[PDB]
Amino acid sequence: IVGNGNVHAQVTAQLDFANKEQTEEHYSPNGDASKATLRSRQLNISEQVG
Amino acid sequence: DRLDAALRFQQEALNLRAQRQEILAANIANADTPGYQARDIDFASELKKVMVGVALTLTSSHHIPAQAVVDLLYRVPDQPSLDGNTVDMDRERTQFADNSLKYQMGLTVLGSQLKGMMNVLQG
């Protein structure tokens, strides 16, 4: 569109030459009883009405 | 464990004797309370019941292990008091002495069994 020679451009690049290593651990929240997965549950209930 | 099965009967008898001893001493202590009923346990039936559970499963280290947590029969009154107290001194004094004697006998038998199991091993 502009024509040969009717355009000039120059590019400079800031690069990344730093070696990085990352380990990510994520736990799904289980505070709601509906999405909570259980292995063992002990429920002792006592009601001594006088 | 097999060691528990051998000593289960005497341990349960000793514990039941201690519990009934506490109940009899409570009957003695509350002799003067008006309206107090003298309570007791049937030793043989409760010993059957104890002689005749599911630890919750621990998947890892953080998982918390399961946390752990008798029937009293009224004594038939002999003399009618006016304040409603049915505790009789003589009957429960004899029962108290008998329970003390049987607790000592159970201690003797359990100690003899443990001492025999020990001299089998010593050498």
UniProtKB/Swiss-Prot annotation, chain A:
It is found in: Cell inner membrane; Bacterial flagellum basal body. It comes from the Bacteria. Induction: Inhibited in nutrient-poor medium. The M ring may be actively involved in energy transduction. Belongs to the FliF family. The basal body constitutes a major portion of the flagellar organelle and consists of four rings (L,P,S, and M) mounted on a central rod. The M ring is integral to the inner membrane of the cell and may be connected to the flagellar rod via the S ring. The S (supramembrane ring) lies just distal to the M ring. The L and P rings lie in the outer membrane and the periplasmic space, respectively. This is Flagellar M-ring protein. It comes from Salmonella typhimurium (strain LT2 / SGSC1412 / ATCC 700720). The lineage of its organism: Bacteria, Pseudomonadati, Pseudomonadota, Gammaproteobacteria, Enterobacterales. The gene is fliF.
UniProtKB/Swiss-Prot annotation, chain B:
Keywords: Bacterial flagellum. The keyword Ubl conjugation does not apply. GO terms for cellular component: bacterial-type flagellum basal body, rod. It is found in: Bacterial flagellum basal body. The keyword Disulfide bond does not apply. Signal peptide: none annotated. Disruption phenotype: Defects in flagellar assembly process. One of its GO terms (biological process) is bacterial-type flagellum-dependent cell motility. It comes from the Bacteria. Its main location: other. It holds the Pfam family Flg_bb_rod. Belongs to the flagella basal body rod proteins family. The basal body constitutes a major portion of the flagellar organelle and consists of a number of rings mounted on a central rod. In Gram-negative bacteria, at least four rings, L, P, S and M are present, whereas Gram-positive bacteria lack the L and P rings. The rod consists of about 26 subunits of FlgG in the distal portion, and FlgB, FlgC and FlgF build up the proximal portion of the rod with about 6 subunits each. Structural component of flagellum, the bacterial motility apparatus. Part of the rod structure of flagellar basal body. This is Flagellar basal body rod protein FlgB. It comes from Salmonella typhimurium (strain LT2 / SGSC1412 / ATCC 700720). The gene is flgB.
